[PDB]
Structure 1
Amino acid sequence: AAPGKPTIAWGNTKFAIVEVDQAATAYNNLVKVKNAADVSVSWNLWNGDTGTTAKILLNGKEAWSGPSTGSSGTANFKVNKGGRYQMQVALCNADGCTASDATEIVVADTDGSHLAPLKEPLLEKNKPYKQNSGKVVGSYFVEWGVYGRNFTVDKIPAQNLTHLLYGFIPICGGNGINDSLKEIEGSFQALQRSCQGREDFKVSIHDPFAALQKAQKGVTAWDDPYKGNFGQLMALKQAHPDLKILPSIGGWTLSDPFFFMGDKVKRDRFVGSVKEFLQTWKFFDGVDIDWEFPGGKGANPNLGSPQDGETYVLLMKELRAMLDQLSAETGRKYELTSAISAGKDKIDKVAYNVAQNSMDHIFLMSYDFYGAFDLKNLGHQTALNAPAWKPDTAYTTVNGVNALLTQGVKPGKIVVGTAMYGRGWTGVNGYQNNIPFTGTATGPVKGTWENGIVDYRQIASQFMSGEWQYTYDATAEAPYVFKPSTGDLITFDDARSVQAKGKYVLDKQLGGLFSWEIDADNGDILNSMNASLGNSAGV
């Protein structure tokens, strides 16, 4: 007789190639990368002969084999590839093999190979588009937006993007290295906790809870190895294998460490740690560098050197060489991008015409031109052109693009930015000819999350009715709303100024459009980005 039919023992069926330690706050203890997952199976045989060899099969293929020595057994073995496997125990003798019924096991890996695709319905006003223009369509998703903003990865209209950028990956360092963080309650300390035991100038994760542990749709089971934003990004990749998901290193409060990378020792260590981050987190497709800004004039009034431009070009060249190498080891295509100031004065600190040779796209931050940070000079925060009342306005999208083109940047590299928010003032007075921008202000407009700034969603929900005037400036290509009783004034992008930018991108042959930040749109801005770049409606 062939052996009797074994019964797989109840036990854990979910294992991980990259393990997350559920009780650790330091990124070094938090993540353990193994060559393979350690898997365990046990069985019982309730009827017949136990055979002479026991085997574990994964989809029919043996992963383990050993002498069958009793009515119960246990197999420990390694599995080096992620996915979901139909596992069987088989008992074999000279008269044949008898296999148990299949139990599925889960071997997790950071490409999301173990995960069901995160395919969600478009929400609010989002309408479906096909990415067939060949133009970049991007947006930033912020790590901390899962809290008060309650905007999670399952809510991203992912089919309407080519590029999804994750803001922000931090670089480790305490006093003197990340002093801009001290301006936000708790945030400097959260980074030192994350970086404990870890060399300065290596990347980390700022909020491992939001990134890897907060329960969220498709990753709510206690034994799911990756939860939070990263686990979702993994499942989103399974649904959209051509979506490029890039980690953005830096941003307004996390840029201070770039200022030290004139030191090649520190720069090498940074580049080495980006390589390691990409081998660790397989769902990411490259690296976005948001150094704000070479030369300073960012959050930290004490940083900035004339050497910065060189550092930048060096850093880009070295990241490319590291991405080329990673690309050859994996067969994947990897991208190197950067978000940059759109002002000519900052643009001219760097030879973008040299650095482009290392970069896939330049994300031109064509927004924040004006805001409550200046109560005396009012203007359009994200306009295409200067307005009729000040044709020599310094900060416009066009002046930005012209500055790169003039350096010799190829126009296809350049991705024009749109705002999914407004900035505005209160108490505007002293203006002439019904143009409130020629006045001066007494304060920030009351904001959605922080004063002087309003999500696009709320501009459309709350500020296009009642006493609010609405004007579309067709020379600038810029909408604004104005409440005369209070002198409340708001400058923003809308469907129309977005069409103007997308049409510009097509006329001028630029690379596409990207936006900050996805949680603030109601669908109007992203819809218009897609339409205006000529993407086809429909699924």
Structure 2
Amino acid sequence: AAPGKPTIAWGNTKFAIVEVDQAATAYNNLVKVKNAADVSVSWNLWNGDAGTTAKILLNGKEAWSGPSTGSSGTANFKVNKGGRYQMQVALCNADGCTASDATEIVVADTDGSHLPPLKESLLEKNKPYKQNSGKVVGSYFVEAGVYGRNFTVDKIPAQNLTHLLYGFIPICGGNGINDSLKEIEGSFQALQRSCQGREDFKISIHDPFAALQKAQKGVTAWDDPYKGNFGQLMALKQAHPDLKILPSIGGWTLSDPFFFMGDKVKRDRFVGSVKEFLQTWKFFDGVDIDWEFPGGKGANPNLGSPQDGETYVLLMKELRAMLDQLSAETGRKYELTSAISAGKDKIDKVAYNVAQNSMDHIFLMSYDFYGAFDLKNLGHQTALNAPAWKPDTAYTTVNGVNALLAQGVKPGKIVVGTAMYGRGWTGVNGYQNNIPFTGTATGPVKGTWENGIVDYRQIASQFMSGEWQYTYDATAEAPYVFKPSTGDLITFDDARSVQAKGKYVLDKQLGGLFSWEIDADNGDILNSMNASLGNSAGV
């Protein structure tokens, strides 16, 4: 008769195609990409004949075969595709085969194919919306937001987004390359640890712990291969296959390296590191470039040149070429985007009418127009139009869009920015006609986490009562709160101001809307972004 029924022996059942050192601090030691995972299985037979041939089945499919010389045996084979497999050991002879009971084995891969969908209920004031408008609805998630802000990937209202950009991937480089990071306590040192033994101008992960080692919902097992933000983003992609998750390179304190990109050698190394990155972390759908203003005026007062415009265009073209190269290897479609200054002065330093041909979307940073960084000239930080008391205001959302359109940039490429936070001053005085914006400030307003900035969440729950005055500027389309006693003034976006931006986008046929700091919203902002763009309310 057929052989006896074998019993799979105790042993580890978790494997990975892409290995990650959960204790590594340096990016070069953090991950190793393999062409396939090395799986091992053993078995024992206590009743019946061991047969003549032994086979390993994965969901009924043979993955290994060998002579069945003993009552006990071991098999070593490779699995090139990730996922959860029902593994069985089958012993066969001339009379037939006898398969053991199934034992689940997990072959992990950076696409999340081994993880169950991360489908979380909407929190706070977030309401379900369907992405059926055809317009962009994005937001940025911050890597370090999982600490103090305690805002994790499982808290993202992912169903109400079409695009999700990550909390900034840094570019390696120490003194003279990332000096701007030195302004942030221990931030420069953190990058130096991540880039240990890694070449300057190659990308890395700023905080390896938050990105892949910190236990988070869905990836909490002590031995899970991918944890942290990346692990959850992988499970998120499984739940929202259509969601575009993009790694954002740069930001205010990580843009210094771009200014050196004029050197083709460095630029090629960079592009090369980006390709390898995407090849390693399969859940990402492309790359977003957040070069904090080509031409200077960024965090570093010693960087910036008239050549940055040319460098920017070349970079975008070269990245797009690299992505086309990758698409031919994977068959997948990748997106190339960039967050840019909404200021005409900075916009005119780049030929976007040319760069747009290599980009899918342009995230216009129509916010931070005003803030505690200037205690003399106050104004709406993210308004649509200029205020009535100053119709000549340069820094407005409309002026940014017009500047781009004037260059020849297609309207559908422009994604208007919205703020899920407010910027404010304190001790504001010397204002006339009951318009605080006409006076001056003595300093920054008390912030939620840092001075001068407050989460929209806190504005709505604490600054919408008491002595706080509330006023919606219908002209510029922007709200603001003011406390006469202490002279505290805060400028931000609200449900209505967002509505105005959404209608504006639809009328001018722009690309959509995106927001900064998804963790700072209580849901009012993203709901408005969705509603104003025409997305239908979900179940």
- Between stretches 258-267 and 17-26, larger displacement belongs to 17-26
Encode CA deviations 1:315-340: one digit per residue, 9 max, x unaligned: 00000011112112222110000000
* CA positional deviation for 1:538: 1.2
CA distance in 1, matches of 2:341, 2:468: 32
Q: Using the TM superposition, give the Cα deviation of residue 504 of structure 1 relative to its aligned residue in structure 2, in angstroms.
A: 0.3
Q: What's the secondary structure of 2:188's corresponding residue?
A: helix
Tell me the residue number matched to 1:131.
Answer: 131
Question: C-alpha separation between the residues in 1 aligned to 2:327 and 2:100?
Answer: 41
Partner of 1:423: 423
Contact kept, 8 Å, 2:253 with 2:299, in 1: the verdict is: yes
Distance between the aligned counterparts of 2:487 and 2:198, measured in 1? 50
Question: Structure 1: which 4+ aligned runs deviate by more than 4 Å?
Answer: none
Tell me the percent identity: 99
Tell me the SS of whatever aligns to 2:40. Answer: strand
Give secondary structure in 2 for the equivalent of 1:137: strand
- 1:95 shift after superposition: 1.6
Per the TM alignment, residue 70 of structure 1 is displaced from its structure 2 partner at its CA by 1.3
Report the Cα offset of residue 23 of structure 1.
Answer: 2.6
Q: Please, which moves more after superposition, 144-153 or 51-60?
A: 51-60
Q: Structure 1 CA distance, aligned partners of 2:70 and 2:388?
A: 89
Instruction: Please say if residues 353 and 409 of structure 2, whose CA atoms lie closer than 8 Å, have aligned partners that are also in contact.
Output: yes
Match of 1:97 in 2: 97
Contact 2:342–2:364 (Cα < 8 Å) also in 1:
yes
User: How far does the alpha carbon of each residue in 1:128-161 deviate from its partner, in whole angstroms, 9 at most, with x for none?
Assistant: 0000000000000000000000000000000000
Separation (CA, whole Å) in 2 of partners of 1:76 and 1:89: 12
Task: Give yes or no for the alignment of 1:319 onto 2:319.
Answer: yes
Listed one character per residue, the Cα deviations across residues 276-335 of structure 1 (whole Å, up to 9, x for unaligned) are: 000100000000000001101111111001100000000000000111121122221100
TM-score, length of structure 1 as denominator length: 0.99
- Following TM superposition, by how much is the alpha carbon of 1:29 offset from its aligned partner in structure 2, in angstroms? 0.8
Unaligned runs of 5+ in 1: none
Q: 1:196-227 CA deviation, whole Å, 9 max, x = no partner?
A: 11111111000000000100001001121100
- Quote the offset at 1:25 in angstroms: 1.0
Q: Is the 8 A contact 2:22 2:225 kept in 1?
A: no
2: CA distance between counterparts of 1:9 and 1:302? 64
Other structure's SS at 2:506 match: helix
| 8 Å contact from structure 2 (residues 38, 77) kept in 1 | yes
Q: How far 1:38 sits from its partner (Å)?
A: 0.5
Gaps of 5+ in 2: none
Distance in 2, matches of 1:310 and 1:368, equals: 26
- Cα distance in 2 for partners of 1:186, 1:391 equals 43
Please give the alpha-carbon distance, in whole angstroms, between the structure 1 residues aligned to 2:331 and 2:36.
20
Distance 2:223 2:24 in 1: 16
Q: Distance in 2 between matches of 1:470 and 1:185?
A: 36
Q: CA deviation at 1:49?
A: 0.8
Displacement, 1:379?
A: 0.2
CA contact (8 A) 2:22 2:212 kept: no
1:40-87 CA distances to partner (integer Å, 9 max, x unpaired)?
101010101111111110011111111112121111110000011110
**Aligned positions of 1:19-58 closer than 5 A:** 19-58=19-58
Conservation of the 8 A alpha-carbon contact between 2:367 and 2:417:
yes
Match of 2:193 in 1: 193
- Superposition pairs for residues 461-476 of structure 1, below 5 Å? 461-476=461-476
C-alpha deviation, 1:21, in angstroms: 1.3
Residues 140 and 516, structure 2, Cα contact 8 Å, conserved in 1: yes
- Please state how far the C-alpha of 1:22 moved relative to its aligned partner: 2.3
User: Per-residue displacement from partner, 1:466-514 (whole Å, max 9, x unpaired)?
Assistant: 1000000000000000000110000000000000000000000000000
Q: What does the per-residue CA deviation read over 1:326-357, in whole Å, with 9 as the maximum and x for residues that have no partner?
A: 11222211000000000011001100000000
- Distance across 1 between alignment mates of 2:435 and 2:293: 33
**Matches for 1:51-450 after TM superposition, within 5 Å:** 51-450=51-450
Bigger mean CA offset, 325-334 vs 339-348: 325-334
Q: Measure the CA separation in 2 of the matches of 1:119 and 1:24.
A: 30
1:11, 1:55 → 2: CA distance? 18
Once residues 138 and 538 of structure 2 are traced to their aligned partners in structure 1, the CA distance between those partners, rounded to angstroms, is 19
Please give the secondary structure, in 2, of the residue aligned with 1:151. coil
Question: Counterparts of 2:434 and 2:24 in 1: how far apart (Å)?
Answer: 59
For residue 247 of structure 2, give the secondary structure of its aligned residue in structure 1: strand
Structure 2 Cα separation of the partners of residues 384 and 164 of structure 1: 23
Q: Secondary structure at the match of 2:237?
A: helix
Worse-superposed segment, 46-55 or 125-134: 46-55
